[PDB]
Design a protein around this ligand. Sequence first.
Ligand SMILES: CN1C/C=C/CCCCN2C[C@@]3(CCCc4cc(Cl)ccc43)COc3ccc(cc32)[C@@](O)(C(=O)O)CC1=O
Length: 156
Amino acid sequence: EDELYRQSLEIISRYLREQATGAKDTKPMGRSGATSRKALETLRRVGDGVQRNHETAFQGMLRKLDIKNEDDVKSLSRVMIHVFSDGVTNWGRIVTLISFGAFVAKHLKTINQESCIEPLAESITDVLVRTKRDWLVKQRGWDGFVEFFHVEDLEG
Ligand SMILES: CN1C/C=C/CCCCN2C[C@@]3(CCCc4cc(Cl)ccc43)COc3ccc(cc32)[C@@](O)(C(=O)O)CC1=O
């Protein structure tokens, strides 16, 4: 059993679907639900900011990718490997990978290709986990992600 993969897929899939549909999935998480819940809540906060802070660049890359159908969505794995995997690994770049994923998912909703969203989530998860497992494990996986982005309450 690959717990890191399963957890990654659940978090990434949920975020992409919630971003596309604008509705929260009410179903419980699987194993390690408390961490997966906090991870999804962290992506909500941080992912939305990345999409807005890099709006122009996001729009430019989307137009360059020219995503119309299932076969274009399939071709994105190669591009993710090219851009994400072949560079420095840090939580910021992982958030961009997943946030751009959400950006693509919303686009797939707009062109009425919602069925490609879960395959896309699987592709993103494959790239993240299968190319960066060592780093992810060393950084404490999703617990580490949550701890990295944790914000202390302000006084007063
Ligand atoms: C906030 N930014 C700048 C934004 C640039 C807009 C273009 C985004 C290109 N992609 C988007 C990326 C490459 C394009 C296809 C694709 C498809 C899906 Cl479904 C998810 C991600 C991607 C790979 O993920 C990236 C990871 C890190 C970076 C860029 C990535 C970058 O770190 C990088 O270029 O190395 C850039 C980054 O983090």
